[PDB]
Amino acid sequence: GHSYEKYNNWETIEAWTKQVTSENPDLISRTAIGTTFLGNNIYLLKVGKPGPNKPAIFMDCGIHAREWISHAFCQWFVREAVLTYGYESHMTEFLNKLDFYVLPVLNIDGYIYTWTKNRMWRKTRSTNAGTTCIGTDPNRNFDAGWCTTGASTDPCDETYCGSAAESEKETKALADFIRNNLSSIKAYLSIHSYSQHIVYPYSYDYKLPENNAELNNLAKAAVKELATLYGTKYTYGPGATTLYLAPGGGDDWAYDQGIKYSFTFELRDKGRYGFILPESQIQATCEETMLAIKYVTNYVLGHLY
Ligand SMILES: CC1(C)[C@@H]2CC[C@@]1(C)[C@@H](NC(=O)[C@H](CC1CCCCC1)NS(=O)(=O)N[C@@H](CCCCN)C(=O)O)C2
Ligand SMILES: [Zn+2]
Ligand SMILES: [Zn+2]
Ligand SMILES: [Zn+2]
């Protein structure tokens, strides 16, 4: 039994990707873009009214296993697309003009593990040579300042960069998909938790992006929009300046592919519950996050390139 207001296990999310697609065939198609270490299909939903030569926004959730609110958000986004297409001006315009590639759970093996064995697991579930320590941080596994300071070379560490860039099947599947569709993809959005931040490049080094002023202004406006609903306070800025060095991230990698609107969202809360955000907060968190995501989407539509 799936519910948008509860955390759903992988079997339930997987069944949902199939069912939401079949229920909405003129708005959603589903593909598998690869398989995980343990052989699970990595599903991707293409959300939008089909048309020729459409630009796209790519959004992933569940790079990190324990960040359950992220997984919940990708589901919420699809919920909103199907519920409000035809009923609300902006969502209607968005789905007509753009496609959204929504990857609801990247790190499926890790997600399963948080349901079965260890709620606080972060990494993938792949094995490592010379140790019994398991897993790689997919968000240190992309080929962008790969495995520099802010990632660990120790396979037993939570920020382990992996044996090589894109060593993880999951990372490679995502990067291959974006490389294959690069000319259409205009924005990259990665959903995480917690701490209430909107981050943009760079995180792999202390440097500001070419369009820093534009991204600063856009993040500032998105944070402002988010706050309108419940007064939730987000901070924002370049990743290395606002958060910490975190090389090998999907956002920096996408940016250096030429996707100039690239953001990481770290959702609620600020540490009271942390990763173990109560189900009672799913609705409010997803609804306010929708406002930021739609603001960014509208901006991208107005500044195509
Ligand atoms: C294992 C750690 C000790 C190491 C530093 C703190 C950790 C707990 C962990 N960070 C997290 O879990 C954060 C949430 C914590 C942030 C600090 C305050 C407490 C919460 N979530 S995250 O992994 O999704 N952050 C993304 C940002 C990357 C943006 C550019 N790509 C990422 O790092 O990939 C990394
Ligand atoms: Zn994360
Ligand atoms: Zn809503
Ligand atoms: Zn402008």
From Swiss-Prot:
Substrate binds at residues 64-67, 122, 139-140, 193-194, 244. GO terms for cellular component: cytoplasmic vesicle; extracellular space. Its EC number is 3.4.17.2. Keywords: Carboxypeptidase, Cytoplasmic vesicle, Disulfide bond, Hydrolase, Metal-binding, Metalloprotease, Protease, Secreted, Signal, Zinc, Zymogen. Residues 6-300 form the Peptidase M14 domain. Zn(2+) binds at residues 64, 67, 192. It catalyses: Preferential release of a C-terminal lysine or arginine amino acid. Disulfide bonds join 61-74, 133-156, 147-161. The active site is at 266 (proton donor/acceptor). It is an enzyme of class 3 (hydrolase). GO terms for biological process: proteolysis. Binds 1 zinc ion per subunit. Its main location: secreted. Its cofactor is Zn(2+). The keyword Amino-acid biosynthesis does not apply. It is found in: Secreted; Zymogen granule lumen. GO terms for molecular function: metallocarboxypeptidase activity; zinc ion binding. Belongs to the peptidase M14 family. This is Carboxypeptidase B. It comes from Sus scrofa (Pig).
